[PDB]
Design a protein around this nucleic acid. Structure first.
Ligand SMILES: [Zn+2]
Length: 595
DNA sequence: GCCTCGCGGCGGC
DNA sequence: GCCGCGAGGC
């Protein structure tokens, strides 16, 4: 197993100073933080652990307070001896999700500075789709070492012990083993990473410097107005009733129900539909009423609970603000998923979604400033296909949907019917998602091979797009992956799936990911760029959220004119300067007003 | 306290 | 590409 004889628990200053001297001369050192809660802003540090060499790791208890607990170094002293090591940029620390550890250390006025290697990210940059990137999983994968899962030394459920209650030597067993494994994992992964500059560059210059900016954004969080949501909740209740009523105008009783089960699904028999919702029961049809009205219902109920009713319950008591959680190593293409307030999931073009964005308030004398990337994936696609047509559309500011419509439908720009710009929009966005022709016919759902004819007309006027496409489908099967403009690799194991039906999903994915991924890398770079500028100049502005391509700030009303200008300089410049970039900036007293 | 289906999650303690 | 939480039958 692992226990009390491996790692040392440091309960006295003399030993601690000895360990600091060796940390001062180590090339890189690991390190962990042990707390009494996962809330990075309300958690109290309970102990730390460091490992300098496989097997050589120790635990330092500072705040264990159970019945009759042994005397320990105080948190204050342990930290004042550890602080200069912790803030020394020349001291390269290694850890598993060092964003947490940065936040906790930030709570004591300590700015963690040697954030050199984060194992969870090395895993993610090594292979995005390889599997779960949590340490227990990396331990079985990279080292076949079954670790001590947290649940063992703390218990499960309600009477789960928090770390400070857990006995000094058991705590030590987990925390020091953690520190040690983290280091061994770094020792396996960093070599492989160094192999080939694509991935290594993303790690070195996007992924790792982003970690402390993500701890800043979460700890800033957002200010929300619980009143506005409550009004929209009463209203959402009302609206559900109609659906309930409108839903029932298309049928039925009977009911016991609602809500799912055999009750709504019953009608798949007599309300003659083809035959687990959102999904199946393709109403992709105008009528039948049942798989249409109950979808309008599920959607607003969702909206109601998930946002309108949960957002008021998530205000942090210490800050009076909501702190969304950004997960850096979870999506397959390189994007950031926000959870708890999952900003990505609030509907952009919907009337009930525009109310939610109104709840996000700018504090007194501050306004919300939004900076969004103007359809960057199409500008990225334009850059990946070397198609002079698309390049020029963007060069002289032509609305690409209308210019594309003028070429595809062979007609003068000035007279483009809006009826044609829509058909041009569908195709254009289609190619970004690697839309398999029928995809167009089902998105712009009403034509058949007319879409096929459309694709022909677009590729004849824009050959570069399918040049791009074939080249990508090629390197996809060939190498087993596709890379973004900087080197991020999506590994596609099923591109060669021996006609495994949706092997073609990997083909789609192959054309999709380079665009999604380069956009993602571009935003991360912009984030790093802006944050840097904030840490140096410290203007009255805080970066409060990031979602889908826009970055939301909270700039002081007086300073907005220069700040919106700086964002405009930073973002479309020290980012992917080889793509033609446009960032739209808005200001309003709330997120939607700034949109 | 128990089972199955449907939507939103995956790190850190 | 696999796990969880929450609702409805019960
Ligand atoms: Zn930890």
């Amino acid at each position: 197993v692992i226990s009390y004889d491996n790692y040392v628990t440091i309960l006295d200053e003399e030993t601690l100073k000895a360990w600091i001297a060796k940390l001062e001369k180590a090339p890189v050192f690991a390190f962990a933080t042990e707390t009494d809660s996962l809330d990075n802003i309300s958690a109290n540090l309970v102990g730390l652990s460091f490992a300098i060499e496989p097997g050589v790791a120790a635990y330092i208890p500072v705040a264990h307070d159970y019945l009759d607990a042994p005397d320990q170094i105080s948190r204050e002293r342990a930290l004042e001896l550890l602080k200069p090591l912790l803030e020394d940029e020349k001291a390269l620390k290694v850890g598993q999700n060092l964003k947490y550890d940065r936040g906790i250390l930030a709570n004591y006025g300590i700015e963690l500075r040697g954030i050199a290697f984060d194992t969870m990210l090395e895993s993610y940059i090594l292979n995005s789709v390889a599997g779960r990137h949590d340490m227990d999983s990396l331990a079985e994968r990279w080292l076949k070492h079954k670790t001590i899962t947290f649940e063992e030394i703390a218990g499960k459920g309600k009477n789960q012990l928090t770390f400070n209650q857990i006995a000094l030597e058991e705590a030590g067993r987990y925390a020091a083993e953690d520190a040690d494994v983290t280091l061994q994992l770094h020792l396996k992964m960093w070599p492989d990473l160094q192999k080939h500059k694509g991935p290594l560059n993303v790690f070195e210059n996007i992924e790792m410097p982003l970690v402390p900016v993500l701890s800043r954004i979460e700890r800033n969080g957002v200010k929300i107005d619980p009143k506005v949501l409550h009004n929209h909740s009463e209203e959402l209740t009302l609206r559900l009733a109609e659906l309930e009523k409108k839903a029932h105008e298309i049928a039925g009783e009977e009911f016991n129900l609602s809500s799912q089960l055999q009750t709504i699904l019953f009608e798949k028999q007599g309300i003659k539909p083809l035959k687990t919702s959102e999904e199946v029961l393709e109403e992709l049809a105008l009528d039948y009423p049942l798989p249409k009205v109950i979808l309008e219902y599920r959607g607003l109920a969702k909206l109601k609970s998930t946002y309108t009713d949960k957002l008021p319950l998530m205000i942090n008591p210490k800050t009076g603000r909501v702190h969304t959680s950004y997960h850096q190593a979870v999506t397959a293409t390189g994007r950031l998923s926000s959870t708890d307030p999952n900003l990505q999931n609030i509907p952009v073009r919907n009337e009930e979604g525009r109310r939610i964005r109104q709840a996000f308030i700018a504090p007194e004398d501050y306004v919300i400033v939004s900076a969004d990337y103007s359809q960057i994936e199409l500008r990225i696609m334009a850059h990946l296909s070397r198609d002079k047509g698309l390049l020029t559309a963007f060069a002289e500011g032509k609305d690409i949907h209308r210019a594309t419509a003028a070429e595809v439908f062979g007609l003068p720009l000035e007279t483009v019917t809006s009826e044609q710009r829509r058909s041009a929009k569908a195709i254009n966005f289609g190619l970004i998602y690697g839309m398999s022709a029928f995809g167009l016919a089902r998105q712009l759902n009403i034509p058949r091979k007319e879409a096929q004819k459309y694709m022909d007309l677009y590729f004849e006027r824009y050959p570069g797009v399918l040049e791009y496409m074939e080249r990508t489908r090629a390197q996809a099967k060939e190498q087993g992956y596709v890379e973004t403009l900087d080197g991020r690799r999506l590994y596609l194991p099923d591109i060669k799936s021996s006609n495994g039906a949706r092997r073609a999903a990997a083909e789609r994915a192959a054309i999709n990911a380079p665009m999604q991924g380069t956009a993602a890398d571009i935003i991360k770079r912009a984030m790093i760029a802006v944050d840097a500028w904030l840490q140096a100049e410290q203007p009255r502005v805080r970066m409060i959220m990031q979602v889908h391509d826009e970055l939301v700030f909270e700039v002081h009303k007086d300073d907005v004119d220069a700040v919106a200008k700086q964002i405009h300089q930073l973002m479309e410049n020290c980012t992917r300067l080889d793509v033609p970039l446009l960032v739209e900036v808005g200001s309003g007293e709330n997120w939607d007003q700034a949109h």
